[PDB]
């Protein structure tokens, strides 16, 4: 149960500059980023152990993303994963690893949460960049649709009803919530 609120708010300003979000909405969003992080992290670890690797790389994040996410989300996630990893690899450094990856979401904390409790695998540098990029992309997608629902309701901020309606009304988000809340 990491708080991603500040990073969610930054992504919300990127995609709906003039839209707010309610504290109950922000809680659901954090719950959602946690569930997604765990499901992808869990699957990547299993993939490495099954194929008896001693490390989680962006390859195992990539496979996990392709297994868990519906098709269009998976394609955009893979695109955003590879772009963030590539930016970071040729980055100018002298900045947060997130700033090198061109992301708002925190690479360090994703690194920390990929290692904690493992004891059977090391975490590559690309793996947490790829996964932060994917968390950022799926946040942007949810907030885009949630903010569109707030506008239809003539509201200036996102409330829980907007997240519910954006998820039920979008084929891929509705399908994804099957694997993620379990």
């Amino acid at each position: 149960k990491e708080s991603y609120s500040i990073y969610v708010y930054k992504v919300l300003k990127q995609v709906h500059p003039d839209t707010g979000i309610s504290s109950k909405a922000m809680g659901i969003m954090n719950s959602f980023v946690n569930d997604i992080f765990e499901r992808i992290a869990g699957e990547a670890s299993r993939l490495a152990h099954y194929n008896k690797r001693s490390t989680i790389t962006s390859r195992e994040i990539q496979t996990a993303v392709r297994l868990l996410l519906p098709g269009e989300l998976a394609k955009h996630a893979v695109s955003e994963g590879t772009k963030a990893v590539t930016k970071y690899t040729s980055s100018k450094k002298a900045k947060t690893r997130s700033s090198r990856a061109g992301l708002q979401f925190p690479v360090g904390r994703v690194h920390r949460l990929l290692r904690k409790g493992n004891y059977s695998e090391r975490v590559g540098a690309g793996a947490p960049v790829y996964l932060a990029a994917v968390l950022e992309y799926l946040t942007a997608e949810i907030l885009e649709l949630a903010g569109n629902a707030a506008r239809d309701n003539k509201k200036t901020r996102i409330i829980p009803r907007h997240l519910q309606l954006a998820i039920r009304n979008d084929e891929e988000l509705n399908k994804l919530l099957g694997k993620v809340t379990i």
């Binding site: 609120s5 708010y9 707010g20 979000i21 309610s22 504290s23 909405a25 922000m26």
Partner: peptide
Amino acid sequence: SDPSWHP
């Protein structure tokens, strides 16, 4: 009774 999140 659900106030806006601000940073």
